[PDB]
Amino acid sequence: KALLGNWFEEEAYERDRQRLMQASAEVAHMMAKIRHHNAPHSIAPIAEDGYLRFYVPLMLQNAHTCGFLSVDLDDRKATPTGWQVECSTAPAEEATSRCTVVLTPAAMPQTDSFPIPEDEADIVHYGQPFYLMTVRELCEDPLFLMSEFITPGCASPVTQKLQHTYFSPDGGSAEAMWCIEDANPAFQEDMRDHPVKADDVIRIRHNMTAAPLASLREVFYNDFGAQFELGCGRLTTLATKRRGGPPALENLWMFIHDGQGR
Amino acid sequence: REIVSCQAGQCGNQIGSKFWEVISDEHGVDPTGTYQGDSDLQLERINVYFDESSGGRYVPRAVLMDLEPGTMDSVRAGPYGQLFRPDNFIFGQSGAGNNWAKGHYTEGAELIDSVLDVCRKEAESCDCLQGFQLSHSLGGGTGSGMGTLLISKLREEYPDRIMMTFSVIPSPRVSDTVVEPYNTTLSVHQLVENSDESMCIDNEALYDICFRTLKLTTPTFGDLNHLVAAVMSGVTCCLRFPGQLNSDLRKLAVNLVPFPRLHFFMMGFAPLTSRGSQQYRGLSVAELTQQMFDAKNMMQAADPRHGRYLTASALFRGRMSTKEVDEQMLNVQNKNSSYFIEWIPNNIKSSICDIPPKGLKMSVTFIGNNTCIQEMFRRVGEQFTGMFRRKAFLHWYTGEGMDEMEFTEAESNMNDLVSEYQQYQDATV
Amino acid sequence: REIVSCQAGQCGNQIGSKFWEVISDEHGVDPTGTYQGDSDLQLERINVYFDESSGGRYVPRAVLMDLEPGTMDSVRAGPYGQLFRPDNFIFGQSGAGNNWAKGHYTEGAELIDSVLDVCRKEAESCDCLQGFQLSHSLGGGTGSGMGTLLISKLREEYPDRIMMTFSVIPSPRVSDTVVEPYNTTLSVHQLVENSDESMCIDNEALYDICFRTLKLTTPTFGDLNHLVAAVMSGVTCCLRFPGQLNSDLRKLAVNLVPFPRLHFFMMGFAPLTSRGSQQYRGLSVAELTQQMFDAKNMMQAADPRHGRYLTASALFRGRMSTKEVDEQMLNVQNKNSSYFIEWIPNNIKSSICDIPPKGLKMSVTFIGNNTCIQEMFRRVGEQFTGMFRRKAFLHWYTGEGMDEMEFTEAESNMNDLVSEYQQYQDATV
Amino acid sequence: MREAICIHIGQAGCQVGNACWELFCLEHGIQPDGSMPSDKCIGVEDDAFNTFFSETGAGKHVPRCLFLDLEPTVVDEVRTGTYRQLFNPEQLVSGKEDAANNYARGHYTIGKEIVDLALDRIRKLADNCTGLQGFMVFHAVGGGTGSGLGALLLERLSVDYGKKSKLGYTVYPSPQVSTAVVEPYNCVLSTHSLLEHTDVATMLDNEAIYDLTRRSLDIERPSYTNVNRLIGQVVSSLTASLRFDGALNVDLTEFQTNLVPYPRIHFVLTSYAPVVSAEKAYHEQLSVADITNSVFEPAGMLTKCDPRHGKYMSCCLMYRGDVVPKDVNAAIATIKTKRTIQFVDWCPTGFKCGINYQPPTVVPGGDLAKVQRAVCMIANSTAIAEVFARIDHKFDLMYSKRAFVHWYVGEGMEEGEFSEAREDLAALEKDYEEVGAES
Amino acid sequence: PNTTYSASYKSLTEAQIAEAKPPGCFAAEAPRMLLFHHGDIGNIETYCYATSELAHTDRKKQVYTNDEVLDMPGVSTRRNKTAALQRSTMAPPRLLPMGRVAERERL
Amino acid sequence: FDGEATALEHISFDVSQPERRLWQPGHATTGLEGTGGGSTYNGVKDPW
Amino acid sequence: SSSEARAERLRRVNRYKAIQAELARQKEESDFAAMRAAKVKAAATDEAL
Ligand SMILES: Nc1nc2c(ncn2[C@@H]2O[C@H](COP(=O)(O)OP(=O)(O)OP(=O)(O)O)[C@@H](O)[C@H]2O)c(=O)[nH]1
Ligand SMILES: Nc1nc2c(ncn2[C@@H]2O[C@H](COP(=O)(O)OP(=O)(O)O)[C@@H](O)[C@H]2O)c(=O)[nH]1
Ligand SMILES: Nc1nc2c(ncn2[C@@H]2O[C@H](COP(=O)(O)OP(=O)(O)O)[C@@H](O)[C@H]2O)c(=O)[nH]1
């Protein structure tokens, strides 16, 4: 441009500015992360009897937010307990590798529960503890969904009404067990050996806390958009003495390959 | 060496529920009773707090007791509603009305029979009872009066056993009752006579801790219950797990109680860090000792500088060498000799458990028989005299058949214990 | 060994946190606190400015101090701002209001208790600290008033320990405050009686270097603080790194302080060059020495030509031969003997540090106790006395709490030290 | 933190408040419904609105304002207006009968029956604010409500909230244009209150704004709307330091001590530049030095009081936009070298510089143009004695034989109050002359 | 049929609200190396070598000449403590079961 | 000698009381191998 | 906490500000180069015609 003043010095300043810089890399990394997370995954269908199966990819859907359980691999925390990867509920169209999960059996049953039959070895039964694992493609280490006790420094990411649920590689642990139950707490006393059907609306409990998984439909903006807060805790319209009546839609879930909640 | 616990009142019910929360977390016990620990260390001494069934289910040795039925109707809806025995829930039709007289003489009496029945069940179910723990609040009617009645009957039945008492001392800064001084005065002398050594909490001290140490805004009573439950779990750490320097409740009482009446202790936990400062702080034994002897970490609304430590106990937890944990407290004694007492050389007693709490490399629970414990009793006595001079709120107590002279007897016991603490604080060799 | 730093006010806080970026760069520390240095030369003395946590993160020994929550939020505005410990962030609800009295007596004094608490905790954390460091500006209220208030207790508690303070003294050309002469006059006497050595920083000379020595078109405060960060890194480079000729804080003090009242240093940096002409400047010790002693390069807005160097110090950094690092000092002394006092032969303390800042071949920091500090002190004292004669702006201070004649005492402590520098400016043997 | 409570006394105060509040909503991105859109691009919400807006659990932002006026027309029309959902239905107090341009009526008869409720609303505003910085009272002493009720309110604030900072943006009578015959009476009666219980008073005469907008915006007939837009722009420039971060941030008490040399001297002029129309906004290079020179120009001032007749005692320059601490320094140095403006001898520095990175916003449908940078003045100078010398001369002219004084007497005011205010204004002349006198 | 308040203080749309506030100016700060660097800024080198390490070495194994000791771009090869520290503190990121390892250490 | 490392290698996966290990196993993968088909409630190896 | 939340907001707003300034400089340079190339090819086409 005009050579008034210290034009040569400004030009050298600018040129060495770009030289030292040598934004675009950050945008490319962001796009690569989005592509890696949203790489579609094939979830297994319902075969023969409509019973949920183990060792198969599946989509976990909430009945209130209509979203699916998802985990964002970045934005973590390194606590003494281990790695802390934030999980939430997101509105997804296809079964992306980010928002898909697989159920695997756990070690210790109820010690009151019945021995599961040989033919139903691969079928998850009501109240049978299981780990929720991210599929292989998301990350070469396994991530396990687990909650923990509500403490002074433990709560939901923004709100504090529910507990802190998260994905972490600290699997094969007591905290990482999750058990399955039907929509009615009253009816979850006699169906404990029966297989769980896929098509029915269903509910997830965390064994250590004895609290059901839920999502408050509270939006927090994560790097993938606007996620719904996810936590553990029984939510009821009336704060009665015992609660446990008509379960709020926060705590209801579903594990169907085909079909979606409303 | 089983320790069998009881929870009296709704305060006691909540504090014991989250105490069992912490204990089940440490021992790997699921809310349904299944043991799901990682190593055999948890299972080695799981019998102190739980007993196994025919199917292997672990049941806590806990007795839930309260005149108000709603508290135990609701605790069944908690995480461990199904963990406790169904027959260990002992409820009355109506609450004590925050009335010590009817909680200890009229409504407690008709229910203390069943409470003693269940307590004897749990006591005789074990091969060697180590202590009767009881968590309650002294500012209420059912927690204080009926709890003290339970303590009296337990002391009569088992004179040579430890009487663990976790009593929530009420404070006027967080006062939510008006018969607070009455109940505190009527329960404290029963605690003095019928408990080998007490363990006393303040809601306001816990609030100060959560304000200026944890840096947290507005949770419910769950935070205070979590801190007190951590202390309750840590006091028996050496009993429940191996360590370089083991200890038990009787050893703690021997090392902390120089005279039978002087058995009130203030507690402190370490380490405590804010939500976003756990990894900004280096967990070391020096930091743990500093937090132990820091006032803001004291869970008791008594200033340690006003008094002197008769004795102190440090139940440390975690892998660490013994010299930097005992010489450190020798050094703090050397630097704060004015805060200690001369005629007891090395008021400090140290115990080491080798299993730290989950998520912490090392920790410690502090216990102190400081003479500053008399501040709360002075305040309670002043409030009691102010209320009693005008005979205020006394017809409720006198209508339950409790005598007039008992209030003066409680006043005399308060003055006697305060005089003992003061005359041992200012005593010279 | 280690030096614990404190930052006061907006200027001091921003300068110190911008310096912590330079320190973390030198020691190979990411904002997350993890260590990434490629050699043990950056790790063997990392404890000088850092302390390790449980997870290995190196937290700076920095005590941030101000009265503005916004200033506490924006002090960590740099990329390395997350490195600071959250508990050290201490601030008041209401700012100083550009008032020395408010920062020193009433509103900043109620927080100096917490300042001393955290500072004493950090000092006791290390083995034994070699000295304290401060970064502040006398133009403002909270940086000057409460900074002097803090160094008061620092000197009282640690009488025999070094007290370095980097004080920014604003000039009337660059002045943006009317109570600036009041604050400077009230703080200078505290620096005199409180600090063993204190270099002065003037935004006028800083801007002069940024305009016609760096030849930059638009440097803001962020680029302005770079010279200060570089020089206050080179002051302790010898502490943090090896060298052919070591030095430390007392090394510099004993050689730059002939008399106790003479510890105000004007000081600068080298090498400096325009970004249009780096590849034409041949980096050598002769060029370094040439650019050390010229008036423009030094970052104090009073030329050395009107004064006589009482003494000077040259902290070189980088692998350089010891012959010409010091015969250059000899040669400049012999060709400018009129600019150096005769009664102190060989006025130059030359020291060599082994490791220069990374990305820099060689560097040197110049710290001189020349007598033209009386120039800044006169140009501020004349304003102070002119604005004090007519009682201007004194009502804020008097209402805030300071006595009327305390300002007369401060002016006296200006004038006596000004005369002290005068009577050695033209001293004869 | 840093909450500031806005009070609007009288019709002029209410309309100035409406202008500054639409400006604040525009700056903070608040719709008239009271809601703020979620900034999805960043993902976490600002806290800059806290100083002027209080959050509700439903996410609605309630302004921290109290509209106090003794007659219901303006407040009812606001209740009917666009910002009805935004404004709190309370804190919008309406009287039943107007003060009728009577200081005695606004301070002695109608003032008492509404000052209790006004203080109740003020307390409900203050206890919400956990970091209350101070009060900003917009009013015109020329009228009856703004004079009398304003004086009473200042009395109660001074006696109940201690030494909390108070910023009285007062519209004083102009040299020639005035809309009342008893306006100088109200002004001279209210000078006592604005001298005793006002920490910093800001001059807002009308002719200066009128001619500034006429010649700078090239607009033939702008109105109260435009002058209130300028007043809101000035107050927003003054208060933006604590809302948006800058190179040099100055709070209310931060520049109060730098502004006020003596407790009796707190009446300050103001100006703003560049106040430039869109047509010529993109042709001139509005540099920092250029805008500083425009501010210091006696014509380019929001107060009709020539500074050359007096001497500057303390100037505070609030820059917003892409200014740099060295461009402001260079402008300051060049203008110190320049001699047509005089600074008092006992204040060598005499300059305060605050810098903010937030360029001023533009009100849609307004006259101010989009400019990259701007700067406002708070100048305490001895020239302000001129306006008082005009107003007290007018008061003496009408008081020589007691014009319009039976109205004040019949409202419970003693005849000696006028005389008392007269020597109060005489002392406010004398102290300014003394501080302006050379040592 | 209308008032001045209605005519001037009109309703505002979302786009108008967004456009009224202008994006604030961003202060420009020079990088650290940019302000203090000499030579080629594109290839920044390091001089973290010790004079004692370079001069005093096993002469039979390896020798550094005088001018090479005085100036040479590189970093010292003594990194045992740094290697130990990195080992202690061990494209989707890796999240090892350090939590389970810590639990096993605790038990 | 890495005492903690060899402890994790051997002691953590060691079994001291196989009776207890079978009776109340937690998250243990060692020692769970018991008698193969010895314990059937039917009391006979024959089908139910 | 309020302090950490406000500081993190400052983090992201400053980062966004820096990116905006950076690609504003890039778009200025790109527009300059595009104008240069467009007029060079326009002059070539004019001479050819
Ligand atoms: N700058 C400015 N001045 C105004 C505005 N409205 C009124 N004024 C002036 O303020 C002066 C005093 O106000 P008043 O007209 O008396 O209204 P008031 O303040 O409510 O007092 P009352 O008439 O008793 O209700 C008038 O003479 C007007 O010239 C306005 O919107 N902006
Ligand atoms: N820490 C804690 N304290 C409690 C809880 N519930 C009540 N309190 C305290 O107990 C006191 C009231 O005693 P109260 O519960 O009525 O006694 P009770 O009726 O005999 O059980 C109050 O001062 C509370 O501070 C709780 O869940 N946790
Ligand atoms: N070099 C430099 N000077 C600064 C900076 N910030 C403020 N200042 C100077 O500090 C003076 C004002 O100090 P102030 O911020 O009021 O100090 P405080 O009140 O203690 O925070 C101004 O004259 C500036 O020149 C900075 O980042 N760098």
Ligand SMILES: [Mg+2]
């Ligand atoms: Mg009116």
